[PDB]
């Protein structure tokens, strides 16, 4: 969950040329962003350690991305060349006992069901 293996598949490019970033998303919204650099020659595999926070019953998702450190003839600083995402933790589902009532009215052509301020 905290350990990730990066593999450089460029023929003639070191991964040091790119700005690394990782983000953690709680139920879709983010909560933690960090930048990093990683040295890896063409072909090489390198490990990446990501400290994780204590996590409540929400659903957590990591996203790891590389971008352009500075402008290029074909694109501007920050442009994203590669990303991958992973489920950290699934969510805990709640189930709630409902005590409140529901009415019902039958007529020739309709069944009517009332609950709070909604009629079906």
């Amino acid at each position: 969950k905290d350990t990730y293996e990066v593999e450089n598949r460029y023929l003639f490019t070191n991964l040091e040329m790119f700005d690394g970033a990782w983000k953690i998303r709680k139920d879709g919204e983010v909560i933690e962003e960090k930048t990093f650099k990683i040295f890896a020659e063409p072909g090489e595999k390198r490990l990446l350690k990501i400290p994780l926070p204590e996590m409540d019953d929400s659903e957590y998702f990591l996203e790891i991305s590389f971008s352009l450190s500075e402008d290029t003839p074909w694109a501007e600083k920050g442009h994203v060349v590669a990303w991958e995402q992973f489920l950290l933790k699934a969510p805990a589902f709640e189930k709630k006992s409902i005590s409140d009532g529901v009415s019902l009215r039958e007529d020739g052509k309709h069944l009517t069901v009332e609950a709070k301020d909604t009629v079906y």
Binding site: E106, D107, G108, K109
Partner: protein, 121 residues
């Protein structure tokens, strides 16, 4: 142009009467819809053909309809009538008379029905 009174009376198989609806109605092309509850009604079947009567009056216009409480349904591929498995003991009948062709009489219709019931159809 003038408004007319609408009355709807239910008559039981016994003969007892009850007013369901009594309201004035402005003259217009409309469809009025009503829903009424009836405790422990006498159910219509081929064994026991209990009929109710509706009596409908709007101004001087008067009509009468004969209905019977009965339910047909399919539960798990089985055919129910009033909540009992039904077996169709039947025959196919042509509206035919050797002297009159298709122009059959009520006296010949009654003969047919009494013969069918007397032979368990």
């Amino acid at each position: 142009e003038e408004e007319k009174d609408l009355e709807v009376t239910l008559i039981t198989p016994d003969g007892d009467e009850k007013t369901l609806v009594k309201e004035t109605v402005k003259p217009e092309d409309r469809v009025l819809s009503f829903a009424f509850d009836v405790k422990d009604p006498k159910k219509w079947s081929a064994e026991t053909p209990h009929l109710y009567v509706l009596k409908l009056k709007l101004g001087e216009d008067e009509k009468k309809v004969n209905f019977g409480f009965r339910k047909i349904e399919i539960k798990d591929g089985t055919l129910l009538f009033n909540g009992k498995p039904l077996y169709i003991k039947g025959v196919n009948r042509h509206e035919f008379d050797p002297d009159r062709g298709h122009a059959v009489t009520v006296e010949r219709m009654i003969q047919d029905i009494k013969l069918m019931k007397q032979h368990n159809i």
